[model samples]
Target: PTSSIEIVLDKTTASVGEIVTASINIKNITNFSGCQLNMKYDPAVLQPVTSSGVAYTKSTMPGAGTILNSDFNLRQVADNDLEKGILNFSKAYVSLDDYRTAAAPEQTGTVAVVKFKVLKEETSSISFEDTTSVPNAIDGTVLFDWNGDRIQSGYSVIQPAVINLDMIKAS
Candidate 1:
């Protein structure tokens, strides 16, 4: 299989008003510097919110150190897909201390985690658009030129929220 990222849900099922954790997991990252993801979802069902009611939260992972790192997360601004429920996130492991350091070694593990409050009983799909460009591509050192530039995986979803219907039926 080709290298790519995966989204892990804390549980395959959820309930209305319940919160679920979605982990952005990375696998088979090789070579150099930066990576990005343009993720889309159904806001009507899965409301992207922090515990504090913020639109989104950025997660941090261990990096190359020496400030061999950088990241930017943009949500629903101008591109203004917030209403449409799209988010753009990116990071670079290139050290300002050393451009000569080139890129980074093979990296793996959770890149980030996001939380969503289930708003409705519909199935919500969290997905990636396409990585053909920087909008959703992984670019590091010379491991480029049609290699690892595309996604090997797609969206993920938790089963529709039960929202007490199961309990009601039992009673």
Candidate 2:
């Protein structure tokens, strides 16, 4: 049995000062309740952006999107080190509640989004470096089924957007 899952970025390039968004996509998967993940970012090259009023309340760090899990958690600080411009993002939920919804777990779709403000002409990337799984050592077991069941499978990390900037008029 070979089930394939994936975590990928939508856009590949952007310009300086312009908003470069990374829509995290999971392909060839099923039932995605919610899960946490740690993505790599360059503190000197790019700046993660953040927004408010998401169905998923609270805003700790920058860049948040996709999946509307009420229990979504993006940990930026863990008491020890600030991580300094890194993402220890996380999200999870179970059972049923009025103030809650379901995360689409079809074949492929946007699971999350991380935006950045190109700090300058630099090559950077927000790769899915540390998103293995919790308790389970599977690819995308990080995902859940429609019944909030565990969906363990192998996930592939595609070439996440490589930040390459070009100024329109630096003169």
Choose the strongest candidate by TM-score. Answer: 2
**lDDT for 20 (candidate 2):** 67
* Minimal lDDT window, size 10, model 1: 138-147
Q: In every candidate, how many clashes are there?
A: 2, 4
Clashing residue pairs, backbone N/CA/C < 3 A, model 2:
31-144, 36-90, 49-63, 73-90
How would you encode candidate 2's per-residue C-alpha lDDT over 1-171 as one tens digit per residue?
334434444445665776666776666565555555555667777766654322111245434454443343322321111244545554544453422353334445565565666667766666545443334524212555556556654555564546552432441
For candidate 2, what is the TM-score? 0.61
User: What would the C-alpha RMSD of candidate 2 be, to one decimal place?
Assistant: 6.7
Tens digit of lDDT per residue, candidate 1, span 1-171? Answer: 445556667766677878777776655545423445566677787767754666653442212222213332211111225676765655543342343233444355565566778887655567665433343343211121113343333323222223334344443
Misplaced by over 4 Å in model 2 are: 1-11, 51-66, 69-83, 96-107, 131-141, 146-150, 165-171
CA shift at 5, candidate 1, in angstroms? 0.9
> Which candidate tops lDDT?
2
Give the Cα-based TM-score of candidate 1 against the true structure. Answer: 0.59
Please state every model's RMSD to the true fold in angstroms: 7.9, 6.7
Against the true structure, what is each candidate's TM-score?
A: 0.59, 0.61
